[PDB]
Each structure stands twice: as structure tokens, then as C-alpha cells.
């Protein structure tokens, strides 16, 4: 894409992951990206079009550093999601509501086969990774209602549940 | 409070686990609990205020009925819940959104205090217990989006994490 989008799109997603992306207006994004209006409309047909754009940007970006070399390495970046900052937490799981069903199915099949991957030689790779991906997902949401407490005792559960 | 209401409300919930709550009508939960609109109106102001009442009807049983006496019944209470019809489940991830915040977090503490109990004796009791719920959850969130497998292959998973510990 053009330099003048990723500008844009960048601008957008350091706003977005601040405040909801709803209450984020084109002005804001043309503060923060040092552009005006009239070239955020030139690229974008709305406030809408430019979310979801940003949206599949994120994810884009985010499956193509997904490489984990060991499991140990797949508790990492889940407890690693799971310190991010609230906003940064919430932010993906409404990004996650802005995608086609599909194109979810295709993401999760994708890291899914690199954990399962991980996995080889275990009883049920394919299930195992799906317990741990489920594990890790579910403490995210959970750190959205609750302090869980030191997430290095977490951490600590994932690795003894991981080299069993 | 009445036998009239709680006919009103299980009728209104046999329809609410079928098809999305929204969708449900007065005419239907009228016919459902063998009763006229002037009773359903005579007892709830409207279909949302049913719908509420429903929902902390369908939590209060919920809560008062989760009592596992082992760390082994909490992993079929979870597998349990998963094995249940689509739109059962799709109703109580809903229900959850219907409830004000400072209950949601009574009920957790609630289950969790139980679930932590269980595990007295472990290296983290707390955090285990969070740990093991997370999965639990987790897994019947992905259900909704595909065929997990044979359920019990997740039994077999979550009660060799409950061994690794």
C-alpha cells in the first residue's frame, strides 16, 4: 500500500487501542496521523471502512510474526498478551467481532497447525494445542474482570501443564 | 414469587434455550406456559423484564446446584456444559451480558471459592483453579465456532493437567 495509507492506518490503530473505536472520529486520526481530512476520505470511504482496514492490517501483521520455534514459546506469547494493557486487550477482541467468519476460521486453523506442529509425537497434538489455546484465551478475557494475581504463577501452571 | 410466575418463567426459558431471547414472543411464552397474554402482562411489565428475571432465575438454580465434592466432578461439569445443544449455550453467554457486573463477579467468587477449595494442597490453589475454569471456558467459546472432536479427549486433557500438579 501507498505510504500515505499505512500512515493513516497506523495513526487509526494508536488511537484505537487508547479508546473504543467507535468513539475514535476521522479529526483525531488526522491529528494523529499529520494529514488532513480531505486525504483520510481519499483512501477511506468512512470511519467504518478505515476500521476494518486497520483491523485486518493488525491481524495480518500478527499471524506473519506468529513463528513459535517450541511450546514453551506459545505460553510466552499468550502470557505475554495476557500483561498487555487493558485497552490493547479489549481493543483485539472487538477487532476479532470486525472480521468475516471465515477469515477467523482461516487464522485460527493457521496458528492451530503451528502449535499442534509444536506438539508432534504427543497422545492428541491437534487436541492439546486446542486446551492450551483455550487456556490461554480464556485467562485474557478472565484479566478483563478479575486481578488474576502474579501471571509468573500462571506462566509456571502453563509450563508444568505443557511438558507432561 | 408466585406459582403463576415461575410457570411464566420456565415456559420463557424452554423458548429462551431454543432460539435467540429476543426473538421470543408474549403470544409464544403465553401458548408455551398454557396461560393468557393478561396473566404474562399481569405479572411482567414487558418481554425484557421477563427476560431479566429468567435469566437471574436460570443463574440462581445454576449457582445453588454447582457443588463438586472432587477436582474430577468440576472437569464433568465443564465437559457437561460443552456437550450441551448449541443454542443452550449461545442462551447462557447471553445471560452473562444481561447481568449487572458486581453479580457476575459474586457468582465467579462463588464457583471459584469452590474450585479452590478442591485443589488445597497444591503448589498455586488460587491460580490453578482460575487456570483449569479458563480452559473450561475457553473451550465452550471455540464449540460455538467449530467441532472440537470427541469431548472426551478434552476429559483426558483436563485431568492430566489436574495430575501435573
Excluded: W
Excluded at 138 to 144: E, K, N
Amino acid at each position: 500500500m501507498t505510504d500515505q495509507s499505512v500512515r493513516i492506518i497506523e495513526a487509526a490503530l494508536r488511537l484505537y487501542m487508547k479508546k473504543p473505536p467507535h468513539e475514535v472520529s476521522i479529526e483525531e486520526i488526522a491529528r494523529e496521523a499529520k494529514v488532513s481530512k480531505s486525504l483520510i476520505f481519499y483512501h477511506f470511504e468512512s470511519k467504518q471502512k478505515l476500521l476494518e482496514e486497520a483491523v485486518m492490517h493488525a491481524f495480518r501483521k500478527m499471524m506473519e510474526e506468529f513463528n513459535p520455534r517450541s511450546v514453551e514459546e506459545v505460553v510466552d506469547y499468550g502470557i505475554g498478551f495476557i500483561a498487555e494493557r487493558r485497552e490493547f486487550i479489549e481493543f483485539m477482541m472487538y477487532a476479532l467481532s470486525q472480521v468475516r467468519i471465515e477469515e477467523l476460521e482461516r487464522m485460527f486453523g493457521e496458528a492451530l497447525e503451528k502449535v499442534a506442529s509444536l506438539f508432534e509425537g504427543c497422545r492428541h497434538p491437534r487436541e492439546t494445542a486446542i486446551a492450551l489455546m483455550a487456556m490461554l484465551d480464556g485467562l485474557s478475557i478472565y484479566s478483563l474482570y478479575f486481578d488474576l494475581g502474579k501471571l509468573e504463577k500462571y506462566r509456571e501452571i502453563a509450563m508444568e501443564f505443557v511438558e507432561s
